[PDB]
């Protein structure tokens, strides 16, 4: 979509695998604010918003907090406390035609600057002079939207770029979007430090004949200590016997 009519995708109730940003080296601009990309697969968020649009190279630098310009003020504005990442790559092969791709537009005039995360698609004739425009164009009466000129021979600053802006919010609500977590192999009959669905401890993991119900995940003994767990990958019940101890 165009930058003035930027499209927003809502990410909710799914494990967020960010390895598609790490592996894919086809990205030109990758800048994060308020959060680090490495410490992102181990952090939860209430919601994640994915904003996508198209601009030129000279305007990619404007997609950042504390920036000014036509794009930052009239098309897409990021707050001063923005917490997220900005990703962009050269899309000259896709968003350029031999006769010039004019399908991507941008707002040229506006009576005021956009608020953070505001989407203005109104085509009201901008009044720049004293004479009021009654919906007609002419003297100091301009159309608010201008079309980009995307040609294959354009300079790198004037070539099209597809931008994706991921924004992370954390409210006083449950967080449904966190991030994947690699698992390791399971070792039986040895003293190990285990972590089952966030429950940690030390003990010997052995096979068991305890018939857990489908909704039951952990077992406990009379002392309220953990007796057994169900392996989250293979639905078998494993006994937890604390590692041998005593006295000499």
């Amino acid at each position, epitope marked *: 979509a165009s930058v003035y009519a930027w499209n927003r995708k809502r990410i909710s109730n799914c494990v967020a695998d960010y390895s598609v940003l790490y592996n894919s080296a086809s990205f030109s601009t990758f800048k994060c604010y308020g959060v680090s990309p490495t410490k992102l697969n181990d952090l939860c968020f209430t919601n994640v918003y994915a904003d996508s649009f198209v601009i030129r190279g000279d305007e990619v630098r404007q997609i950042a907090p504390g920036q000014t310009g036509k794009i930052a003020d009239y098309n897409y504005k990021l707050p001063d406390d923005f917490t997220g990442c900005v990703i962009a790559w050269n899309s000259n092969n896709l968003d350029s035609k031999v006769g010039g791709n004019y399908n991507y537009l941008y707002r040229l005039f506006r009576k005021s600057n956009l608020k953070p995360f505001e989407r203005d698609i109104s085509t009201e004739i901008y009044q720049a002079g004293s004479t009021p425009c009654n919906g007609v*164009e002419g003297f*100091n009466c*301009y159309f608010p939207l201008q079309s980009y000129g995307f040609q294959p021979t354009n300079g790198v600053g004037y070539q099209p770029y597809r931008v994706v802006v991921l924004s992370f919010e954390l409210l006083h609500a449950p967080a449904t979007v966190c991030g994947p977590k690699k698992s390791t192999n399971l070792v039986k009959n040895k003293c190990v430090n285990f972590n089952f669905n966030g429950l940690t401890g030390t003990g010997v993991l052995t096979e068991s004949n305890k018939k857990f119900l489908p909704f039951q995940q952990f077992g406990r003994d009379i002392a309220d200590t953990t007796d057994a767990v169900r392996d989250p990958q293979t639905l078998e019940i494993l006994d937890i016997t604390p590692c041998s101890f005593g006295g000499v």
Partner: antibody
Amino acid sequence: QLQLQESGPGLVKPSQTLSLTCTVSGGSISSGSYNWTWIRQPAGKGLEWIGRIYNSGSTNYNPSLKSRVTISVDTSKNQLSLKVRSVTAADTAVYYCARHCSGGTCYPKYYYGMDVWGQGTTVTVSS
Amino acid sequence: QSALTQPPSVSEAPRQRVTISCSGSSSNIGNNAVNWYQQFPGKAPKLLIYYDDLLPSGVSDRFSGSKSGTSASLAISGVQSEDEADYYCAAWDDSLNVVVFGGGTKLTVLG
């Protein structure tokens, strides 16, 4: 084929009135949403905005020269003229005429840009 | 008048990048569009960049304009012998009620 043609006397006598012309060819002068301005440039120095004319007569001039300048438009002759009264040696410059677009009926739509310029007539103020 | 200030000359090697800055105040560049013009010796100025960063048809895409705050800059990636001229920045000053032009910048390719 939008071209502007300037004509005027190369020499003007001090304290007398200077008069230039800027004839528009390939179109009409009163068509789009344009500000028809005058600009002079002393040889070796920078450009100086003299004034402008728009709509149907209304004008706005440079305040340092507002009282001595007059900018008219002859629609029948399809030309705009410049009048500079009580000239001095400091008024010796190369004078240009250009059109400044301020609207949506400009072709091409070069907003705020001085689209087409004149070739420039050289005025030398000396007796 | 002299609100917009440009360096008198800037020189760089061929196939390099040159930036021509244009310094003003909040009454012109801060709240009004900035236009750039190219003027060759003995000829009238030619519109090079209009409305801060827009490029007219027929002008090489090696030219590009930018604006941040009360200052503008002109970038010519890939300097060529064809580019030797005087470059002026222009803007309407709200205080002076006047279209203000810079002193001009003379680009001399070095090679």
